[PDB]
Amino acid sequence: MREVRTIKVFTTVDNINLHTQVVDMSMTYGQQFGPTYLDGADVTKIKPHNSHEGKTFYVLPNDDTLRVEAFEYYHTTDPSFLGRYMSALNHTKKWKYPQVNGLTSIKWADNNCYLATALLTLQQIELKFNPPALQDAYYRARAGEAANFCALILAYCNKTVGELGDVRETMSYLFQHANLDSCKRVLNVVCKTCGQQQTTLKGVEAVMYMGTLSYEQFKKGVQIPCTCGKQATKYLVQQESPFVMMSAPPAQYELKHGTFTCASEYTGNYQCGHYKHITSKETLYCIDGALLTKSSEYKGPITDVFYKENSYTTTI
Ligand SMILES: Cc1ccc(Nc2cc(C)nc3nncn23)c(C)c1
Ligand SMILES: [Zn+2]
């Protein structure tokens, strides 16, 4: 029929290791590679153009070499991961990432305010990621090119662009891919009936607590039901970590300058709302995507507070 015409392109799963391919310009990328993406755009149903020659396309890990490369870079073997990452990237590459008070933020789009406050929070706590994909993308994000980092957060969290997201859950996912091995927490629970029992927590469980926003109150003791039915007290015995994260269902809470690192504010309900970020510097700054305001005091519906730590031992 038609004289065969070809171009050379490269396929990849990590945008570093390239794989030479010769493609037939009369067949779609999908017929030759399976699902195929060009900087996030789905080109599966597109036939090669001359302008494509020499360009790099993402594909799914469909042979053993690509499977190993994908696991080594992303630390996942979820079959749909790369598709979800590319689908997110096609949107996040169009977002804007302004510098707000020296931090990379995200201009509002696509219901992304939970991602903005997560990204702002990471830049204020000591954290190293384990997957090279997150290491590389986070470095770019700090420099101001955060599109790949934001698309990876979405893919790791199984959230699509626009989907309702929770900051505490997002942070927990990101912490699972970070090196928290040297973090340790010891708690004690005291019941006037049953007595007392210590517990040691490690890793992500050592830096996250759900039930109170106040780190000081956590050191003093919080009231929880004992398994016997009577009210008991749980308090922090020992902490070794560079930060802690305290979370609670949103409630009116007063943030005092100098007593915390940063916080997440949620205005809304369980199906509808909006996040803002508060950071304690020379004064209290409220970052709302690209928007910035200041105040000497702050009271709002807070749901997460971050604090600095290094080593703490109770006197109780
Ligand atoms: C001897 C004894 C046995 C059971 C309990 N009850 C308990 C222990 C722990 C570790 N966490 C708890 N959360 N709710 C209750 N908890 C206590 C305080 C002492
Ligand atoms: Zn008890």
In Å, how far from its chain's centre is CA 47? 35
Ligand nearest to the CA of 225: 1
Q: Between helices 64-74 and 81-92, what is the axis angle to 10°?
A: 60
H or E element at residue 53: none
Output the CA–CA distances (angstroms, integers) from residue 114 to 22, 57, 103, 273, 274, in the order listed: 42, 30, 16, 10, 8
Let me know if residue 83 belongs to a domain: no
Q: Is position 150 annotated as part of the catalytic site?
A: no
For residue 77, count CB atoms less than 10 angstroms from its CB and return exposed for 0-12, middle for 13-18, buried for 19 or more: exposed
Whether residue 267 sits in one domain with residue 191:
yes
Let me know if residue 1 belongs to a domain: no
Range of the domain at 127: 88-176
Q: Of 60, 78, 99, which residue constitutes the final position of a domain?
A: 60
- Nearest-10 Cα torsion for 15, 137, 157, 246: 170
Q: Name the β-bridge partners of 103.
A: 100
Q: Is position 113 annotated as part of the catalytic site?
A: yes
Q: Name the β-bridge partners of 58.
A: 12, 37
Which of 113, 150, 157, 183 is catalytic? The answer is 113
Q: Between helices 147-156 and 132-143, what is the axis angle to 10°?
A: 140
Q: 91: which residues sit within 8 A by CB, 6+ positions away?
A: 109, 110, 151, 161
Q: How far is the CA of 250 from the centre of ligand 2 (A)?
A: 29
Contact (CB, 8 A) for 44 and 30: yes
Whether residue 296 sits in one domain with residue 190:
yes
Kindly state the tokens that stand for 179: 């090196």
Overall size of the chain counted in residues: 316
Let me know if residue 67 belongs to a domain: no
Whether residue 152 sits in one domain with residue 268:
no
For residue 310, count CB atoms less than 10 angstroms from its CB and return exposed for 0-12, middle for 13-18, buried for 19 or more: exposed
Longest dimension (CA), the chain: 88
Q: Name the β-bridge partners of 233.
A: 190, 223
Q: Is position 274 annotated as part of the catalytic site?
A: yes
Contact (CB, 8 A) for 298 and 304: no
Q: Name the β-bridge partners of 104.
A: 99
Q: Using a 6 Å cutoff on CB, does residue 200 contact ligand 1? A: no
CATH number at 118 reads 1.10.8.1190
194 is in an annotated binding site: yes
Contact (CB, 8 A) for 189 and 196: yes
Output the CA–CA distances (angstroms, integers) from residue 98 to 103, 127, 288, in the order listed: 8, 22, 11
Cα–Cα distance, 230 to 272 (Å, whole number): 36
Atom of ligand 1 nearest to the CA of 228: 6
Q: How far is the CA of 212 from the centre of ligand 1 (A)?
A: 19
